[PDB]
Amino acid sequence: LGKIARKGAKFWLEGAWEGLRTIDASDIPTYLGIPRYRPDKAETEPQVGTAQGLAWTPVGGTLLTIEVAAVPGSGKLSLTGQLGEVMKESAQAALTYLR
Amino acid sequence: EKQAIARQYLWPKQVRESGMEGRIEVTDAAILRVISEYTREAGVRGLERELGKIARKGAKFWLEGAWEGLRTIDASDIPTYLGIPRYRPDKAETEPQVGTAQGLAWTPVGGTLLTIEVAAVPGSGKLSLTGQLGEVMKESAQAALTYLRAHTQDYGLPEDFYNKVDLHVHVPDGATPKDGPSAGITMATAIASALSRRPARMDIAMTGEVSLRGKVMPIGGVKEKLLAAHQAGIHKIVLPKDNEAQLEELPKEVLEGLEIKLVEDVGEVLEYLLLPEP
Amino acid sequence: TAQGLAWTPVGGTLLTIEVAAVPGSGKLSLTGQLGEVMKESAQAALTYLR
Amino acid sequence: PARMDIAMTGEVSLRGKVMPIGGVKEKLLAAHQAGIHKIVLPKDNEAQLE
Amino acid sequence: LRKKIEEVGMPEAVKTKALKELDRLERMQQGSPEATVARTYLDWLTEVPWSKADPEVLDINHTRQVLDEDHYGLKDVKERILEYLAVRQLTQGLDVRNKAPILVLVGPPGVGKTSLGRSIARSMNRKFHRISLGGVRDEAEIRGHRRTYIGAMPGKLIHAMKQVGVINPVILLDEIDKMSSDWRGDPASAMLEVLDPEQNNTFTDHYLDVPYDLSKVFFITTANTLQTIPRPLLDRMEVIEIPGYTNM
Amino acid sequence: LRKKIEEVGMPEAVKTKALKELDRLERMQQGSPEATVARTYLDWLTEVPW
Amino acid sequence: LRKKIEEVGMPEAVKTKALKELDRLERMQQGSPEATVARTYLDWLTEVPW
């Protein structure tokens, strides 16, 4: 709202187009940048790989698509993201079900 | 923009410094020669010193013998005043190299070209993290490896290299100076050239981010990566598809050398930087 | 044994390298307050050799 | 066995390439006091031979 | 010392501060610290002659001859000096103003830095000096120690001025890399100040009160370490690399 | 200075403190800091622009 | 300073030391913090609510 407000002062004091003004939808990316976050994440052609957890974060929750790469090979379990063991527990548990 | 800074304000400052007003004159490729040859900075400090030394050699060579008051210095004889090229005049000349991925990044005193080199040995299957790495380049390398293990029919590799090739990886500035692991397709190019044993193309810098399905995800600060490629003498840049949006706010001076080959799947950056691809 | 050239701003001086290739396991041994960049160029040395 | 009266300065790469050096003439000041008659250099600092 | 001020020619500011430190006299001169430090500042000032110069050479050819007689030019270090002096024959606006550094010297320990500076003073036809810089404990061999009481140490620069008679010497600044001070604040500040061309004309110390005009004087500097110097001593300090010597 | 405390335009409490600097002096002008500390402090708060 | 103490309704566990810094008076401010810290700490005692 600050960036809208200050650029409003700009586009005003170059020379006033009016005495009272209006901004509705899609009269925003003039006043702001590119729209940073695209609309609802439903739009997004469901992915071959990975679903998306909700999650805690100590400054309040978010989403976390947990990507999994089934790579043909030996028979192991790595865990990137520098996980604890606790994900290896849960991965092995879910893997046990599937077994 | 550097040249126009020169002819408008800089070079008359120097030929007012050395008292040579109405004595020395300077061309187009003169200033452009001092620019593409005798500094790789990120401002205009070095250009004002180099124009200082042109001014002082003009003082002496006019001084002990004073014939002309209209001295034209063109782009063929500036080594009389300054000497050897301290840099390549052209980085369109650097001859496809094996383990060399030209990085792009922002050392926060000026744009760089963080050339990761990676050496592939024979051995046991293990990653080594030289250049004082954190975990970050290891895991992006691991991601590039998992992508590549998904696609070993292409790159000539036998299907089970990962058990028998130990990896030795050299990273100058082995942590992220921008605070960003944005050298994803850098290390993808480096590792695919290192393990493919085939030279990675010079003259096309690249910057990005990879993830395990094979995705060139987007980066932050696109302008500064483009300026580092513009200072340090590279011309073609490779950027993610998800930055058409940041791209068109750019002041159209910045865009006038660059030739972008936008990617989103890492097979498409890797079809451009390798000439012998498998 | 290999002799080392350097500048030093105290006036010029020199070095010598002394290497004891002992029976071991690949595990690199450095002595003489050998700096980290000598450690990395040693990594590059043994790596080039590999 | 190595050689005698041949000394050297140079930067290696993890590919094993001589990356050039700074302060060449200074190294020859500190080194060519020690009389070592054949010194090996990076290819790129012919730029400071001249 | 009352006659001394109009016995010795002065600039106006040196004249006026000499009159000032004359005025604080004429009581007990064995204690009473205003009187004794006024006597010292009156002696250290008024016994500096003025209103006269060395011959300032305007000839690099004379200079190229004179410098090539103590050691023999050494193929690089001479012509950097000749560049600096080449703009000295092309001073802007027809006033001899610097707007430039003062050619600080670094090299190996043992090469002819003294020969360089005194040889310059011959070639510039000037009177050489060198004062105390290399390893000083407080700004009393570098800068001034503050007055209105004795215990104040005079300037060794003011000693070189009381030793010279003229207004353009060649003040050697030796081994500034180890210049320290017990005074909070670098004398490197008084270095980077005085070397800009119009800051010596108004320059004082803690020992100097009215502007002791150091205006018309080229300065020169040596040290012997390639890495360590104050950051304000990389503007208005033109580092010239000096090499050691080989067998011929 | 007692001329200038008027002349140096200042705020009220600052003028007051300046006269207090005036009153703690008028007995020390040879002095180890007891002169110079109040003399340079009078000179500062005269030469700061109000 | 005295009235400001006696128009706030304070505990006598305050007004004891209030009258103590009323006793500590008749000293310098221009030569030392001696009545400065006295009067200002005492005004802290006044202007906190009881």
Residue numbers in the entry:
A (entry chain C): 547 to 645
B (entry chain D): 497 to 774
C (entry chain E): 596 to 645
D (entry chain E): 695 to 744
E (entry chain E): 249 to 496
F (entry chain D), G (entry chain C): 249 to 298
From the paper:
The Lon protease is a AAA+ protein found in prokaryotes, archaea, and eukaryotic organelles. Lon is involved in cellular protein homeostasis by degrading damaged or misfolded abnormal proteins, which prevents these unwanted protein species from forming toxic aggregates. Lon is known to form a homohexamer; each protomer is composed of multiple domains, including an N-terminal substrate-binding globular domain (NGD), a long-helix domain (LH), a three-helix bundle (3H), a AAA+ ATPase module, and a protease domain. We show here, using cryo-electron microscopy (cryo-EM), that the activation process of the Lon AAA+ protease may involve a pentameric assembly and a substrate-dependent incorporation of the sixth protomer to form the substrate-pore-loop contacts seen in the translocating state.
To provide a comparative context, we also examined wild-type MtaLon in two states: without any nucleotide (MtaLon-Apo) and incubated with 5 mM ADP (MtaLon:ADP). Unexpectedly, both MtaLon-Y224S:ATPγS and wild-type MtaLon, whether with ADP or lacking nucleotide, predominantly formed left-handed spiral pentamers or spiral hexamers, rather than closed-ring hexamers. Surprisingly, the pentameric form consistently emerged as the most prevalent class. The pentameric assembly forms a left-handed open-spiral structure. The open-spiral pentamer forms a large gap between the protomers Ob1 and Ob5. The pentamer forms a tensegrity helix triangle (THT), consisting of three overlapping LHs from Ob1, Ob3, and Ob5, forming an interlocked, letter A-shaped structure that tethers together five protomers.
